Design a protein around this nucleic acid. Sequence first.
DNA 1: CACAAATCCATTGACAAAAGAAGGCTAAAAGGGCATATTCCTTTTGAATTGTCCATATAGA
Length: 51
Amino acid sequence: VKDINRRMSIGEAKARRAKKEMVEANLRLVISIAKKYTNRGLQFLDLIQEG
DNA sequence: CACAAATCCATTGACAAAAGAAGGCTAAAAGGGCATATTCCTTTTGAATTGTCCATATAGA
Protein backbone atom coordinates (compact mmCIF):
# COMPACT_ATOMS: atom_id res chain seq x y z
CA VAL A 1 0.00 0.00 0.00
CA LYS A 2 2.85 2.37 0.80
CA ASP A 3 4.54 1.70 -2.55
CA ILE A 4 1.16 2.32 -4.23
CA ASN A 5 0.24 5.61 -2.62
CA ARG A 6 3.84 6.84 -2.63
CA ARG A 7 3.94 6.36 -6.40
CA MET A 8 0.58 8.14 -6.37
CA SER A 9 1.92 11.13 -4.48
CA ILE A 10 4.94 11.22 -6.81
CA GLY A 11 2.64 11.37 -9.82
CA GLU A 12 0.50 14.10 -8.29
CA ALA A 13 3.51 16.21 -7.32
CA LYS A 14 4.84 15.86 -10.86
CA ALA A 15 1.50 16.95 -12.28
CA ARG A 16 1.48 19.97 -9.96
CA ARG A 17 5.01 20.75 -11.11
CA ALA A 18 3.92 20.71 -14.74
CA LYS A 19 0.88 22.89 -14.11
CA LYS A 20 2.98 25.39 -12.17
CA GLU A 21 5.33 25.47 -15.14
CA MET A 22 2.69 26.20 -17.75
CA VAL A 23 0.79 28.77 -15.70
CA GLU A 24 4.03 30.60 -15.02
CA ALA A 25 4.52 30.51 -18.77
CA ASN A 26 1.20 32.19 -19.51
CA LEU A 27 1.00 34.88 -16.81
CA ARG A 28 1.99 37.25 -19.64
CA LEU A 29 -1.06 36.17 -21.64
CA VAL A 30 -3.16 37.01 -18.62
CA ILE A 31 -1.72 40.51 -18.30
CA SER A 32 -2.36 40.97 -22.01
CA ILE A 33 -6.02 40.03 -21.74
CA ALA A 34 -6.39 41.92 -18.46
CA LYS A 35 -5.10 45.26 -19.72
CA LYS A 36 -8.33 45.85 -21.57
CA TYR A 37 -10.69 45.79 -18.57
CA THR A 38 -8.59 48.53 -17.11
CA ASN A 39 -11.01 50.89 -15.33
CA ARG A 40 -14.38 49.16 -14.97
CA GLY A 41 -14.23 49.47 -11.18
CA LEU A 42 -11.89 46.62 -10.24
CA GLN A 43 -8.21 47.25 -9.51
CA PHE A 44 -5.56 45.94 -11.86
CA LEU A 45 -4.03 43.22 -9.73
CA ASP A 46 -7.51 42.03 -8.89
CA LEU A 47 -7.96 41.53 -12.63
CA ILE A 48 -4.65 39.78 -13.18
CA GLN A 49 -5.20 37.56 -10.14
CA GLU A 50 -8.70 36.51 -11.10
CA GLY A 51 -7.42 35.99 -14.60
C1' DC B 1 -90.01 47.14 57.61
C1' DA B 2 -91.59 42.96 54.08
C1' DC B 3 -93.08 41.81 49.47
C1' DA B 4 -93.28 42.91 44.41
C1' DA B 5 -90.88 44.28 39.93
C1' DA B 6 -86.89 47.12 36.63
C1' DT B 7 -81.79 47.02 36.18
C1' DC B 8 -77.17 45.41 36.57
C1' DC B 9 -73.26 40.96 35.82
C1' DA B 10 -72.20 36.22 34.16
C1' DT B 11 -72.29 31.77 30.43
C1' DT B 12 -74.07 29.46 25.41
C1' DG B 13 -73.64 29.81 21.33
C1' DA B 14 -72.93 30.79 17.04
C1' DC B 15 -70.52 33.57 13.48
C1' DA B 16 -67.35 36.40 10.91
C1' DA B 17 -62.72 38.26 10.39
C1' DA B 18 -57.81 37.48 10.81
C1' DA B 19 -53.67 35.52 11.05
C1' DG B 20 -50.05 31.53 10.85
C1' DA B 21 -48.98 28.09 7.71
C1' DA B 22 -48.44 25.36 3.62
C1' DG B 23 -48.23 24.28 -0.88
C1' DG B 24 -47.95 25.50 -5.55
C1' DC B 25 -45.82 28.89 -8.53
C1' DT B 26 -42.85 31.71 -10.95
C1' DA B 27 -39.34 35.17 -11.28
C1' DA B 28 -34.62 35.24 -10.42
C1' DA B 29 -30.06 34.07 -9.15
C1' DA B 30 -26.11 31.27 -9.62
C1' DG B 31 -23.27 27.60 -12.13
C1' DG B 32 -20.88 25.78 -16.23
C1' DG B 33 -19.01 25.58 -20.67
C1' DC B 34 -17.34 27.56 -24.69
C1' DA B 35 -10.66 25.18 -29.11
C1' DT B 36 -7.75 29.90 -36.20
C1' DA B 37 -4.73 33.15 -32.77
C1' DT B 38 -4.39 37.41 -28.35
C1' DT B 39 1.80 37.19 -24.58
C1' DC B 40 5.53 43.38 -19.54
C1' DC B 41 0.62 48.65 -16.80
C1' DT B 42 -0.06 54.85 -17.30
C1' DT B 43 5.48 74.93 -0.76
C1' DT B 44 8.18 75.99 2.47
C1' DT B 45 10.10 75.24 7.40
C1' DG B 46 11.62 72.44 10.76
C1' DA B 47 12.93 68.18 13.01
C1' DA B 48 14.71 63.58 13.14
C1' DT B 49 16.81 59.64 10.88
C1' DT B 50 19.94 57.64 7.87
C1' DG B 51 23.65 57.26 5.12
C1' DT B 52 28.36 59.94 4.32
C1' DC B 53 32.68 61.98 5.15
C1' DC B 54 36.46 63.90 9.10
C1' DA B 55 39.24 64.21 13.43
C1' DT B 56 41.69 61.44 15.68
C1' DA B 57 43.61 58.07 18.65
C1' DT B 58 45.85 54.14 18.76
C1' DA B 59 48.50 49.98 16.93
C1' DG B 60 51.83 47.89 13.96
C1' DA B 61 55.99 48.65 11.00
